[PDB]
């Protein structure tokens, strides 16, 4: 008896479960198409070097990685963005900008679930916050398309520049990424200890700025035209104008856990406070300069997982079981009628219908139950008497005789 | 400067290439839907035990496998069928039969390409050759849907039972799988040496039966009602009746390289003799008994790779570059018109159109070139004068003024 359960931390997707995933992925695809994003992909197996960002990120700490027989250090990707950057760096000048690219990669971790799918959406070559607006609107669009309202969820929005100014005014730029990574852990005294463990108080000014409840209060401390203030107002104006003002809001505690975000950062959340972040993203204008690009390339994007959204949708009763369906089930009255049943099967499919034929040998009434079981819209019985007349019997399920030509 | 090339033996799919893959996958999905198959998935990471079939299979020799930090023996799947069987064994009595399941998994190997996508289609719980008929017709259907004709390709069909009878008449059942695996390598004297290396001449009778050019010649040696003869005639009758008689033919040399096939086996091929097999499959009625099932479960299916088909389609000029398209590109006359452009963007998308908005700051004529570049069907300019009139300018690309309501 072989082991029927999957490998540790991984999910099986039999048809029932697969219909749920496909319901979600259809939306991710549909939303990307609606927003003009182009699909891409890359190996799930990338070199380990790609994720050595030396900043204590949880994503790179929990990296599912190994050595090949040939000695190479690789990993099942913990995220897509580095892969995207590699592709972009590879294209160089040939890449026409701006580019809007998406994918729904499976991503991995070691030490609970070890895999998830993550819709990625990234805009490349756009300096202005219109990028972040579009991205944030796409995330809302997908949630709305799944039946969620602005009463169910929102997106918290912030800029890392505010904090950058504080870290800059408090004496070096190099430590900013480790700082963001610790500060991200705030949601206690342990995080204060980590900031001390990093070195240097500036800790106090960080806590207060994370607690500032509005942009005007940021403007009090930054002036009405810090980059961050101008950007956020621009951001909120555009999202308001697009018609999703009830979906977004400011929150100064939002930094995200990733090292490479340089500007606007954001996070999807359920308004009942029950679930982890639904999606997360931001601007990362220096990543490609880090990977070696001679010219700086502005980038922004987000990742949107397949689990939290599903738990949420289940809680809201927005994931009813989707039963399998099929247009026609062709029933041979008996085995002598099979070749004729097959010709009819061909006609049905030729015309763009989805059809089965009873493959095994069974009595008509069993075949009808089977048809009902697989969610057939109508059953097409192919019997001798009707066949002579150039006909079949058709019964709608959601037995009048019909010519072959009139079936489709 | 980071490494821009992907990991060894793996493919990047930037948008250009991804459109090609998606063109192929659309057909695999569309064909599965047409034939009533239900989608499923399972981890790419499976336990290594799943593929220890001890029969010298090339698929299990070339297994991309490793040990976890926790000591477990796993592998990136070299094929899907064992995963499918695991799922089936797991369901047991709950699984309603017959079941028709499909997937388009990425599968792996170590020692040339180390990964490929493989459309799988499997029918479970059907004793009769109607299963193999359906499967073979689906494979033809996909190739026809890609623009190929029966003049371009075919499917060679055979039964392993004929040979089984010869191995049985020549003295044990246990050695049959290793024998098939060697005999599969025939397409010289090295294969004769491998049959001797296995033991035991019966070798001679094997060579002659592989060379028998028709079923009547099989019937000469098996009788008109060997299981295999009755099955193949049944098979060919049904495929003829379905209307794909020009696509299929008998070939006694076809065994396939996999251990678990017990009955009908088949192989897609280009009629110019230029390419390796396009797809391959057959009946495997004992696999689930091997994995521990208390009741025998009849199964048949095939795998259909993503590379050979593409080379073939490229040779036949059936893979023209598919350019990106989008319905609308919204052009703000300048930055003061952005909020209005955004409201229009919202209307367009609300109505099920795919639309971009010029995200960056640029002059109208650049925005029009950009629109043409991304394959926009029409450009929607949002200027002050027209906005006052409740209007925008619309230009078809494959500048009349229009009311907002009349856009969609
Ligand atoms: N890679 C980020 C999301 C993201 C995509 N693009 C930019 N950010 C994450 O895994 O959370
Ligand atoms: N797993 C087989 C194809 C197949 C699917 N189902 C049955 N056979 C292969 O890789 O060639
Ligand atoms: O980076 C990640 C995060 C969560 C999971 Br599950 C896999 N990989
Ligand atoms: O089993 C296989 C066969 C070919 C390739 Br590429 C990967 N895996």
Determine how β-strand B248-250 pairs with β-strand B264-270: unpaired
In whole angstroms, give the CA distance from residue B94 to residue B177: 31
Q: Are B89 and A127 within 8 A, CB to CB?
A: no
Closest to A108 in 3D by CA, of B45, B66, B48, B105: B45
SS3 content of chain A, % helix, strand, coil (to 5): 40, 20, 35
Closest to B310 in 3D by CA, of B49, B119, B73: B119
Interface test with A, best of B7, B135, B376 (most A CBs within 10 A): B7
In whole angstroms, give the CA distance from residue B72 to residue A5: 15
Q: Which CATH superfamily is domain B1-318 in?
A: Bira Bifunctional Protein; Domain 2 (3.30.930.10)
Record the tokens describing residue B25, joined without a space: 């996958």
Chain A residues touching B355 at Cβ < 8 A = 34-36
Supply the DSSP symbol for A265. Answer: E
Give me the torsion for CA of B280, B248, A350, B147, rounded to 10°.
Answer: 70
Record the tokens describing residue A184, joined without a space: 């991200």
Record the tokens describing residue B146, joined without a space: 């890609």
Establish if B153 touches chain A: CB-CB under 8 angstroms. Answer: no
Assign A13 to helix, strand or coil. Answer: strand
Supply the DSSP symbol for A41. Answer: B
| A79 labelled binding-site residue | yes
Residues making up chain B, counted from first to last: 408
Chain B residues touching A125 at Cβ < 8 A = 360
Nearest-10 crossing angle of helices B130-145, B227-242:
40
CATH level 3 topology of B319-408 = Rossmann fold (3.40.50)
Q: Are A7 and B46 within 8 A, CB to CB?
A: yes
In whole angstroms, give the CA distance from residue A211 to residue A207: 6
Q: Which helix (H) or strand (E) holds A279?
A: strand A279-283
End-to-end Cα separation, chain B, in angstroms: 47
User: Measured in angstroms, how far is the CA atom of residue B168 from the centroid of ligand 4?
Assistant: 32
Name the residue of B58, B63, B106, B120 to mutate for ligand 2: max ligand atoms within 8 A of Cβ: B120
b vs e for A340-361, b when ≥16 Cβ sit within 10 Å of the residue's Cβ?
Answer: bbbbbbbbbbeeebbbbbbbbe
Mark out the alpha helices in A247-351 (DSSP H runs).
287-290, 308-315, 338-350
Establish if A294 touches chain B: CB-CB under 8 angstroms. Answer: no
Place of tokens 């010709």: A343
User: Measured in angstroms, how far is the CA atom of residue A260 from the centroid of ligand 1?
Assistant: 10
In whole angstroms, give the CA distance from residue B176 to residue B170: 11
Residues with CB under 6 A from ligand 3: A 59, 78-79, 107-109, 113-116
In whole angstroms, give the CA distance from residue A89 to residue B12: 13
Q: Is residue B331 within 8 Å of B364, Cβ to Cβ? A: yes
Record the tokens describing residue B278, joined without a space: 């396009």
Per residue, what are the HEC states of chain B? Answer: CCCCCCCCCCCCECHHHHHHHHHHHHHHHHHHHHCCCEECECCCEEEHHHHCCCCCCHHHHCCCEEECCCCCEEEECCCCHHHHHHHHHHHHHHCCCCEEEEECCEEECCCCCCEEEEEEEEEECCCCCHHHHHHHHHHHHHHHHCCCCCCCEEEEEEEHHHHHHHHHHCCCHHHHHHHHHHHHHHCCHHHHHHHHHHCCCHHHHHHHHHCCCCHHHHHHHHCCCCHHHHHHHHHHHHHHHHCCHHHEEECCCCCCCCCCCCCEEEEEEECCCCCCCCEEEEECCCHHHHCCCCCCCCEEEEEEECCHHHHHHHHCCCCCCCCCCEEEEEEECCHHHHHHHHHHHHHHHHCCCCEEECCCCCCHHHHHHHHHHCCEEEEEEECHHHHHCCEEEEEECCCEEEECCCCC
Of all protein residues, whose CA lies closest to atom 8 belonging to ligand 3? A108
Q: Is residue A266 within 8 Å of A282, Cβ to Cβ? A: yes
Q: Are B359 and A238 within 8 A, CB to CB?
A: no
In whole angstroms, give the CA distance from residue B366 to residue B370: 6
Sign of the CA dihedral with A163 first, then A169, A170, and A175 last? positive
Closest to B246 in 3D by CA, of B142, B155, B175: B155
B355 alpha-carbon distance from chain centroid: 32
Nearest ligand by distance to the CA of B116: 4
Q: Are A100 and B356 within 8 A, CB to CB?
A: yes
Establish if B39 touches chain A: CB-CB under 8 angstroms. Answer: yes
In whole angstroms, give the CA distance from residue B19 to residue B321: 8
Domain boundaries, chain B: 1-318, 319-408
Establish if A94 touches chain B: CB-CB under 8 angstroms. Answer: no
CA-nearest residue to A88 within chain B is: B4
- Backbone dihedral region of A352: left (phi > 0), alpha (psi from -120 to 50 degrees) or beta? left
- The pair phi, psi for residue B138, each rounded to 5°, is -60, -45
Establish if A276 touches chain B: CB-CB under 8 angstroms. Answer: no
Closest to B156 in 3D by CA, of B139, B142, B179: B139
| A53 labelled binding-site residue | no
Between the alpha carbon of residue B66 and those of residues B184, B216, B322, B363, the distances in Å are: 28, 49, 39, 55
Nearest-10 crossing angle of helices A176-183, A189-198:
170
Q: Is residue B384 within 8 Å of B336, Cβ to Cβ? A: yes
Q: Are B342 and A3 within 8 A, CB to CB?
A: no
Between the alpha carbon of residue A289 and those of residues A115, A159, B118, B328, the distances in Å are: 30, 20, 37, 33
CA-nearest residue to B15 within chain A is: A40
Residues with CB under 6 A from ligand 4: B 59, 78-79, 107-109, 113-116
Chain A residues touching B104 at Cβ < 8 A = none
Q: Are A354 and B66 within 8 A, CB to CB?
A: no
Q: Are B359 and A18 within 8 A, CB to CB?
A: no
User: Measured in angstroms, how far is the CA atom of residue B341 from the centroid of ligand 1?
Assistant: 28
| A80 labelled binding-site residue | yes
CA-nearest residue to A127 within chain B is: B360
Q: Which of A2, A44, A68 sits opposite B292 (nearest CB)?
A: A2
What order do you get walking across the sheet with B376-382 strand by strand? B355-357, B326-332, B376-382, B391-396, B400-403
Place of tokens 């930055």: B335
Place of tokens 């002050």: B384
Record the tokens describing residue A305, joined without a space: 């997982």
Q: Are A291 and B357 within 8 A, CB to CB?
A: no
In whole angstroms, give the CA distance from residue A364 to residue A341: 13
Q: Is residue A121 within 8 Å of A141, Cβ to Cβ? A: no
Chain A residues touching B347 at Cβ < 8 A = none
Record the tokens describing residue B109, joined without a space: 């190997």
| A144 labelled binding-site residue | no
Resolution stated for this PDB structure, in Å: 2.2
In whole angstroms, give the CA distance from residue B135 to residue A357: 12
> Widest CA span of chain B, in angstroms?
94
Query: How many Cβ pairs within 8 Å bridge chains A and B?
Result: 224
């Amino acid at each position: 008896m072989v082991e029927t359960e999957p490998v540790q931390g991984c999910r099986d997707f039999p048809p029932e479960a697969m219909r749920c995933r496909r319901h979600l992925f259809d939306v991710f695809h549909a939303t990307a198409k609606t927003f003009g994003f182009e699909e891409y992909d890359a190996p799930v197996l990338e070199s380990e070097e790609l994720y050595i960002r030396k900043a204590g990120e949880e994503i790179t700490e929990q990296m599912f990685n190994f050595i090949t027989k040939g000695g190479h250090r690789v990993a099942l990707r913990p995220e897509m963005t580095p892969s995207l950057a590699r592709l972009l760096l590879g294209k160089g000048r040939s890449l026409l900008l701006p580019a809007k690219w998406y994918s729904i990669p499976q991503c991995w971790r070691y030490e609970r679930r070890r895999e998830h799918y993550q819709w990625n959406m990234d805009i490349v070559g756009v300096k202005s916050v219109s990028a972040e607006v579009e991205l944030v609107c796409a995330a809302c669009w997908a949630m709305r398309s799944l039946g969620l309202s602005s009463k169910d969820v929102g997106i918290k929005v912030n800029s890392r520049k505010v904090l950058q100014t504080v870290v800059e005014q408090a004496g070096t730029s190099d430590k900013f990424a480790p700082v963001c990574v610790i500060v991200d852990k705030m949601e206690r005294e342990e995080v204060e200890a980590q900031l001390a463990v990093l070195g240097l108080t500036v800790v106090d000014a960080i806590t207060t700025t994370l607690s500032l409840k509005s942009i005007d209060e940021i403007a009090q401390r930054v002036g009405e035209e810090h980059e961050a203030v101008k950007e956020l107002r621009q951001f909120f104006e555009q999202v308001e104008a697009y018609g999703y003002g009830d979906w977004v809001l400011f929150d100064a505690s939002v930094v995200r856990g990733l090292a490479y975000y340089t500007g606007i950062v954001f996070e999807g959340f359920d308004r009942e406070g029950k679930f982890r972040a639904l999606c997360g993203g931001g601007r990362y204008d220096n990543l490609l300069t880090t990977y070696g690009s001679p010219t700086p390339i502005p980038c922004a994007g987000f990742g949107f997982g397949d689990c939290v959204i599903v738990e949420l949708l289940q809680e809201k009763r927005l994931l009813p079981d989707i039963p399998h369906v099929v247009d026609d089930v062709v029933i041979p009255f008996d085995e002598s009628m099979r070749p004729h049943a097959l010709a009819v099967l061909r006609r049905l499919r030729d015309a763009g219908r989805s059809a089965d034929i009873i493959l095994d040998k069974k009595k008509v009434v069993q075949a009808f139950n089977y048809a009902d079981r697989v969610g057939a819209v109508r059953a097409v019985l192919v019997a001798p008497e009707e066949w002579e007349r150039g006909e079949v019997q058709v019964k709608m399920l959601r037995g009048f005789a019909v010519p072959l030509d009139r079936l489709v």
